Design a protein around this ligand. Structure first.
Ligand code: CDL
Ligand code: HEM
Lengths: 55, 430
């Protein structure tokens, strides 16, 4: 809280955090697409998809 | 000089006193486009019957050599001999091919020829990739139209034939109004006409069947992928010009601009072809060539290539099609000047080779469409008259944003989808 309850020290640090975290999500999405690229997407049949690929 | 007389059958002759051989032949205006998917391969079977062991033996006893050629628009049967014996070739052609066909269509001979042709077609379909890829390109370009039937015939259809199909085809297509009698080498036109007149040499009545559908081009592709082969073979083409088009020679020159390339010959790496500047660095291909093929109803303009770089196919196709794009907008005069002389030498060897069989085939196939044979000299002036504006006008019509046909086999997994290739036919920067 930065104090004894929710007051000025709370909101003023909640906003500066709110501007930061989306830049962390954007960095985790980059790491999220890095783990998606090693093996690729799946298909609804649940079987191998390496036989028929399109760009 | 080329001399043609319409008396009797259309008789064409090209005299060359220097040659030590003479060819006499018959060229028919029917080909693999005159047959249907159920008797496909009847022309090849007729060819192999004319080339059978007994017929060839009786021919070679007199001292004669037999040639047969099957194509989309004509069938050629040629007898070649020494200049003194040119009259004997007519006698053999009359006695064997024309007058009687019962002996050649016996049961045992037909079965043996059928089994040999089946073996040949079976070997072709599995162990000859660059040519069967071109055959599939034809079959996918002109599908459901006469021009797409393979000239050798399919394996499944060749089994169903009997002698009845052969004799029916002979009745329907071997006619006086469909035939040209050709003479090449050391023979005179007057002597040839006199020799024909002494005999009857009548083929049949006439009125060959007329096809109900004219050949049409469809943008399409066929992929025959096989991962047990070491390379990938690819043939790509667009619609071209037919025979008797005003833009025939412009088409051949535009083809000659890009030419052919072999990676292992040291000289062909120094050619003025600018395309090589993009290919040579990463060894994209082993060989390529460019073609402008013309038929009676339509044509094909494109290239064919083979490569072991199975991971860089799209780069090869991309660079080739960007070189094609350059024709419409920014072709330069030096390119055309080099192309003129390269084409003239290219046409020069084709029409002026020593072997008279090629001359006979060309003259017979030419007079069956044009009605006369263009001279070598008049060919050059049209070649020399070609300018940059003509090349741009032809390219803006025939290959700018036009449908394509593709056929490939082997490790063609790197070959991208159809649309990605189709989009490369324009630049989008112009
Ligand atoms: C997500 C989008 C993915 C799009 C992929 C794509 O278009 O790839 C085609 C294609 C695939 O590459 P390629 O054909 O193998 O090699 C490049 C070609 O040689 C490229 O050569 P090109 O001559 O075929 O095309 C060159 C291209 C290059 O474009 C630019 O440089 C722009 O020039 C233009 O597009 C000029 C017209 C631009 C009009 C823009 C209109 C206003 C917006 O790439 C391009 O041609 C690039 C086009 C990019 C256009 C802008 C895309 C949006 C940018 C934000
Ligand atoms: C901004 C947030 C996110 C973005 C932009 C994102 C983007 C993507 C993309 C582009 C793919 C590949 C395409 C697809 O499968 O549809 C993917 C796959 C996947 N994502 Fe996400 N994702 C996000 C959040 C999440 C979350 C929150 C989860 C799980 C709680 C998740 C789990 C997955 C899984 C399991 C796959 C694989 C699906 C498959 O291959 O069938 N993602 N993601």
């Amino acid at each position: 809280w930065g104090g004894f309850s929710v007051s000025n020290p709370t909101i003023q640090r909640f906003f500066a955090l709110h501007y930061l975290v989306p830049f962390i999500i954007a960095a985790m999405v980059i790491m999220h697409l890095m783990a998606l690229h090693i093996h690729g997407s799946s298909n609804p049949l649940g079987i191998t998809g390496n036989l028929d690929r399109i760009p | 000089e080329v001399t043609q007389l319409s008396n009797g059958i259309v008789v064409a002759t090209e005299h060359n006193p220097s040659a030590h051989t003479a060819s006499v032949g018959v060229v028919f205006g029917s080909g693999a486009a005159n047959e249907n998917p159920y008797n496909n391969g009847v022309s090849n079977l007729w060819k192999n019957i004319f080339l059978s062991k007994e017929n060839s033996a009786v021919a070679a006893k007199e001292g004669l050599a037999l040639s047969s050629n099957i194509s989309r628009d004509f069938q050629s049967y040629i007898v070649s001999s020494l200049p003194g014996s040119t009259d004997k070739s007519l006698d053999f052609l009359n006695q064997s091919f024309i007058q009687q066909k019962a002996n050649l269509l016996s049961s045992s001979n037909f079965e043996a020829t059928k089994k040999s042709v089946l073996k040949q077609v079976q070997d072709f379909e599995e162990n000859d990739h660059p040519n069967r890829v071109l055959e599939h390109l034809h079959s996918t370009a002109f599908q459901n139209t006469p021009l797409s039937l393979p000239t050798r015939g399919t394996l499944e259809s060749l089994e169903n034939l009997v002698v009845a199909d052969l004799e029916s085809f002979a009745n329907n297509h071997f006619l006086n109004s469909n035939a040209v009698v050709v003479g090449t080498g050391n023979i005179k036109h007057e002597d040839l006409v006199n020799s024909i007149e002494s005999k009857n040499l009548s083929l049949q009545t006439g009125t060959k069947p007329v096809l109900k559908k004219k050949a049409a081009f469809l943008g399409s592709e066929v992929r025959l992928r096989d991962d047990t082969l070491p390379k990938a073979w690819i043939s790509l083409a667009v619609e071209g010009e037919p025979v008797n088009s005003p833009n025939y020679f412009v088409a051949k020159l535009a083809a000659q601009i890009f030419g052919s390339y072999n990676a292992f010959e040291p000289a062909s790496r120094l050619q003025g072809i600018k395309l090589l500047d993009n290919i040579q660095e990463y060894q994209l291909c082993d060989n390529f060539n460019h073609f402008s093929l013309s038929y009676k109803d339509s044509g094909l303009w494109g290239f064919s290539t083979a490569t072991r770089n199975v991971t860089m196919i799209d780069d090869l196709i991309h660079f080739t099609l960007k070189q094609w794009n350059r024709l419409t907008i920014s072709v330069t005069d030096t390119e055309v000047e080099r192309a003129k002389s390269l084409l003239k030498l290219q046409l020069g060897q084709l029409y002026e080779s020593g072997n008279p069989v090629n001359d006979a085939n060309l003259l017979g196939a030419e007079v069956l469409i044009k009605g006369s044979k263009l001279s070598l000299g008049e060919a050059f002036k049209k070649i020399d008259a070609i300018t940059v504006k003509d090349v741009k006008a032809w390219a803006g019509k025939r290959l700018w944003d036009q449908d394509i046909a593709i056929a490939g086999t082997g490790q063609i997994e790197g070959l991208l989808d159809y649309m990605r290739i189709r989009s490369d036919m324009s630049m989008m920067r112009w």
